[PDB]
Amino acid sequence: PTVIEDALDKIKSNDPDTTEVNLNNIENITTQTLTRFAEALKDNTVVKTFSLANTHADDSAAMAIAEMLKVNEHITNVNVESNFITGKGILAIMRALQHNTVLTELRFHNQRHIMGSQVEMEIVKLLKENTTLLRLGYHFELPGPRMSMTSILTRNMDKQRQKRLQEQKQRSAHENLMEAIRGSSIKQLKRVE
Amino acid sequence: AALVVDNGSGMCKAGFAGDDAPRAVFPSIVGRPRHQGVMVGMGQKDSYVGDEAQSKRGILTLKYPIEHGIVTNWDDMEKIWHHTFYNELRVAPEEHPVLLTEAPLNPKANREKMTQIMFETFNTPAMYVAIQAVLSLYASGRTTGIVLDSGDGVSHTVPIYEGYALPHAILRLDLAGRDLTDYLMKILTERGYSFTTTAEREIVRDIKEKLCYVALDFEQEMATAASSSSLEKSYELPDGQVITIGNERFRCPEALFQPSFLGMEACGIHETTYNSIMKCDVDIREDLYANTVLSGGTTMYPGIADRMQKEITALAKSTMKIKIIAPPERKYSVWIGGSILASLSTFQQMWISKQEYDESGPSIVHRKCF
Numbered sequence: 001p002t003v004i005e006d007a008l009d010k011i012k013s014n015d016p017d018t019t020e021v022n023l024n025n026i027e028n029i030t031t032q033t034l035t036r037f038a039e040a041l042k043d044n045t046v047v048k049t050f051s052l053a054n055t056h057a058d059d060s061a062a063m064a065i066a067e068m069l070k071v072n073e074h075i076t077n078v079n080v081e082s083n084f085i086t087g088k089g090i091l092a093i094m095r096a097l098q099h100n101t102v103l104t105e106l107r108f109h110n111q112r113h114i115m116g117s118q119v120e121m122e123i124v125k126l127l128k129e130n131t132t133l134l135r136l137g138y139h140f141e142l143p144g145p146r147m148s149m150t151s152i153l154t155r156n157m158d159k160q161r162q163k164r165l166q167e168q169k170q171r172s173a174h175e176n177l178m179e180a181i182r183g184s185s186i187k188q189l190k191r192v193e
Numbered sequence: 194a195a196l197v198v199d200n201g202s203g204m205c206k207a208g209f210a211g212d213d214a215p216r217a218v219f220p221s222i223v224g225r226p227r228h229q230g231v232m233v234g235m236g237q238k239d240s241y242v243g244d245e246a247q248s249k250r251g252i253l254t255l256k257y258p259i260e261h262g263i264v265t266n267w268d269d270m271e272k273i274w275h276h277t278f279y280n281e282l283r284v285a286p287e288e289h290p291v292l293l294t295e296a297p298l299n300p301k302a303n304r305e306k307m308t309q310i311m312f313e314t315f316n317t318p319a320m321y322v323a324i325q326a327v328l329s330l331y332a333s334g335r336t337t338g339i340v341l342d343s344g345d346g347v348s349h350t351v352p353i354y355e356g357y358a359l360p361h362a363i364l365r366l367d368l369a370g371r372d373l374t375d376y377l378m379k380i381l382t383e384r385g386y387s388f389t390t391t392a393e394r395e396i397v398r399d400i401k402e403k404l405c406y407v408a409l410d411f412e413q414e415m416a417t418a419a420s421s422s423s424l425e426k427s428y429e430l431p432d433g434q435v436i437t438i439g440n441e442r443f444r445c446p447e448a449l450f451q452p453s454f455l456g457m458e459a460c461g462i463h464e465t466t467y468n469s470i471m472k473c474d475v476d477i478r479e480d481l482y483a484n485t486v487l488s489g490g491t492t493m494y495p496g497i498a499d500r501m502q503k504e505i506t507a508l509a510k511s512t513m514k515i516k517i518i519a520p521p522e523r524k525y526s527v528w529i530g531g532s533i534l535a536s537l538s539t540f541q542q543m544w545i546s547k548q549e550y551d552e553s554g555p556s557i558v559h560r561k562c563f
């Protein structure tokens with residue numbers, strides 16, 4: 001429910017009033033069209049969210065996006081869900097994020113096929129060196145990579161907690177609680193369906 | 194004005210503290226385009242959540258953020274939580290403290306991330322984290338006992354002493370309601386009608402919940418079944434056809450007591466409970482025996498508590514009294530216990546405040562909670 005031609009025209013025009021780029025559920029299925037969307041956004045600075053969900057996008061598009069994420073320094077969120085990307089395109093993007101300070105959310109759910117154990121542990125390896133990414137939209141099948149990842153994203157957000165900390169700056173109770181929990185019952189609660 | 198949120202492995206119940214029941218109950222589930230690229234009924238969306246996900250399933254692949262009570266996808270977990278606050282509950286997380294629940298033996302990393310999401314993303318004034326089993330004990334008006342929490346994915350035995358679960362004596366059994374729908378599926382398929390379509394597996398789960406029960410004496414109810422038709426019951430599928438099961442009714446949940454029926458070398462829930470009690474201090478065992486609380490949807494079978502009393506009475510010492518408590522509202526006992534707790538004025542001192550987190554970070558959850 002969005003026209004590709006004129007919107008793209010606004011990207012390369014760097015229209016001040018285009019902070020969202022939403023290509024979700026579009027039949028275009030043109031690898032070239034999406035790859036020139038990447039080049040279009042490459043020098044853009046207004047866009048903060050570039051999404052293409054379920055567009056039959058392939059690995060090349062993931063490559064264009066991958067290299068580009070280092071040029072573009074204003075997109076905070078990228079979405080490539082429900083497309084057909086392999087560990088190649090995804091790992092390319094991750095290697096891009098090896099040095100990319102802006103991007104903070106990246107989602108690739110419901111892909112064509114499983115990434116693979118080695119691909120997942122690779123993801124966690126690369127992103128170990130990233131500090132700005134806060135949300136990763138993927139379900140790791142292996143517990144190791146998954147726990148490593150949640151630890152990473154926790155410390156990246158913690159950096160926000162710390163920087164905000166310095167910026168903004170410059171038992172009887174339990175026993176009585178239990179005594180209270182024993183004296184309770186459902187008859188004290190607001191009846192509602 | 195506290196909020197309570199019980200995140201089940203497959204069902205999410207969220208509401209306000211001090212309420213009799215949760216105001217919101219929807220499937221903890223996030224669905225996305227099935228596949229074959231752009232075969233879309235959705236206009237401009239990348240995914241659906243909650244009720245909209247259960248419907249529209251025709252072209253959706255439905256994925257749960259919580260597996261076996263442990264968060265395995267934190268992005269879809271944050272989605273479910275946003276959907277909870279803003280779409281189903283209609284509240285600002287910034288103006289309410291939040292009580293969240295976790296499963297027994299939850300990793301510390303997931304506890305920290307839970308807290309970090311609550312304080313950073315949703316910017317809640319305060320928040321707290323409690324074990325579901327413990328909130329079921331509190332809901333039964335008890336502070337000491339042992340809880341058998343069997344839900345969708347996994348089953349846990351949790352000894353509790355004066356408000357603190359005992360991690361050394363917690364026991365885990367990887368057998369729950371879904372294993373019993375699967376079992377019932379197989380025994381029904383084998384003998385005549387094929388239950389393959391998931392839409393029909395929902396019919397199998399409905400048979401389970403409507404007609405299955407737990408036999409006190411299995412080999413007697415088998416012999417009764419073979420001698421007479423006294424135990425037969427029929428069920429009306431959607432196409433008007435009817436099926437008659439009798440012997441499957443109690444064989445399905447028998448797996449809870451004999452996991453071997455599912456090719457499992459583990460021991461049933463009765464042994465798992467007793468064994469947990471034996472790992473506890475010999476002083477409190479007698480109050481564990483007398484206070485064995487049931488929670489979770491899989492504990493709703495008729496006669497489940499009767500056979501608990503029998504089998505555990507056979508394991509324990511002739512001296513002890515074995516009382517098995519099977520509350521009503523056992524499907525929502527976790528939430529209701531949370532509603533009580535969050536309502537108690539004696540609990541307001543226990544919340545974690547956002548300033549404490551801003552100082553110490555999410556690690557503060559390991560103490561000040563457990």
Ligand SMILES: Nc1ncnc2c1ncn2[C@@H]1O[C@H](COP(=O)(O)OP(=O)(O)NP(=O)(O)O)[C@@H](O)[C@H]1O
Pocket residue numbers: 200201202203204261262343344345346347369370371398401402403489490491492493494524
């Ligand atoms: N009357 C019933 N008889 C038997 N099983 C039932 C009944 N009602 C519900 N169930 C089952 O109970 C389960 C629901 O348990 P539930 O209380 O939702 O746990 P959960 O929180 O969603 N998952 P978990 O986090 O693993 O405890 C499902 O497998 C249902 O099929």
Ligand SMILES: [Mg+2]
Pocket residue numbers: 201325342343344489527
């Ligand atoms: Mg539960």
